[PDB]
Amino acid sequence: QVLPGAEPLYSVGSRIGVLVSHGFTGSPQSMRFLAEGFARAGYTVATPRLTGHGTTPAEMAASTASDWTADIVAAMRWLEERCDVLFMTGLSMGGALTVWAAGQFPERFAGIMPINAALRMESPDLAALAFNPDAPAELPGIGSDIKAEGVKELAYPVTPVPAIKHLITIGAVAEMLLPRVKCPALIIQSREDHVVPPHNGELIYNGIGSTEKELLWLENSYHVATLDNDKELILERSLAFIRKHSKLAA
């Protein structure tokens, strides 16, 4: 069964498509505001629900980085039936997936919008859980890192430990592919992040092969920005990004 508010969200629109990716332990709902704003300028929109996500933490414990990347690729396929121009955006690990997609498929995307991309967790305590024989099955969850008041994120309350390695792999693979990313990039990174070291934003800026790159520092937001109060601005600045580079409908 799928937890309520965490169903996947695919709107049919023009020949312009946006792939919108949620994060680790999270669901599309953290993304549901942003995906909706795209589906309303008419774009075709795919917001997949990653394997193991939005159901049970035990099912996530059995999900791999191969699964999640396959979920992204199925979402592209779906989009590529309906579109000649594609774009991707994601949050956190979903932002690491964005950097991965643009690099795996150097030519597929017209531009990307990584927000708080989980490239380098920079946390030794997390790495100690990746291959630790004696670790407990569950740990406290990492969600709701938001400045706004009363704003909850629907994300698992536990971090299933045997999935941690996979988060690290996507971050690492993504970082190693930075040189190949050629498309325009609007990198979105909170000034203060308690989950992901915001040096990730600058890592990306210096790393990518793109000559059409801009870093946008958030200011009244923490990690889960798409739900924050700096969020309306993201949707806004994102749309102006799509337009400048798509050149279609628009």
Next chain:
Amino acid sequence: QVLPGAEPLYSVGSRIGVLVSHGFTGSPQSMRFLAEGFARAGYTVATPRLTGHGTTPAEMAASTASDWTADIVAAMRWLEERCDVLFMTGLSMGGALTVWAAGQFPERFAGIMPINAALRMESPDLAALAFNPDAPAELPGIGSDIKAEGVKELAYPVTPVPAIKHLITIGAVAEMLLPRVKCPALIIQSREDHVVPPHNGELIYNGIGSTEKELLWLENSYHVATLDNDKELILERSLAFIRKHSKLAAAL
């Protein structure tokens, strides 16, 4: 069936143990100079055959980073059966497992000697194979990077594509664990390496919380240095290291 010369080297001795890890697509053969060195200098030694290695690329293609960490763990526990002072050394990915181990088990190790740790491969092309749906099953292997005329390593001829990710995972976990390695380290990086970027050494020396750390440049060898010209120099410099830090080594 295990290919000739790739069997593990499990040698008994004193109360001081050395675990010795080989690399990716590699086997013990590439570590047999070192190990037989240590066994000879008294110490108990474990030189495991990493899961999927030294048999067939197809078996390796089915093996994971979980398997390989668990293999190092199993060997480590085999030493603990007979030992109370432990040391780790490995080549390449074996290097990263060494750094991983030191960080995973902060208290467990008297010292580490990572040789050309495969922490950051820094190759876009290899990354684009990590999760490639339409990549072939096999690519040309990476073995035998040796400055020394006439010297050949026993590594698979191919690199199985599905195992590539696990190589990167290990490298990245190790990297993230550097702050927690606090034990004495002899960091042995080649100056000319065509498999792992040689700036990896530097990445380690400035990375560890260890306070007893030494960076040692090799100058007459490539990546697979445990066989190069300097294999002798390494064995020797490592014994000094073990002897320096254990003090339970009395050897005539």
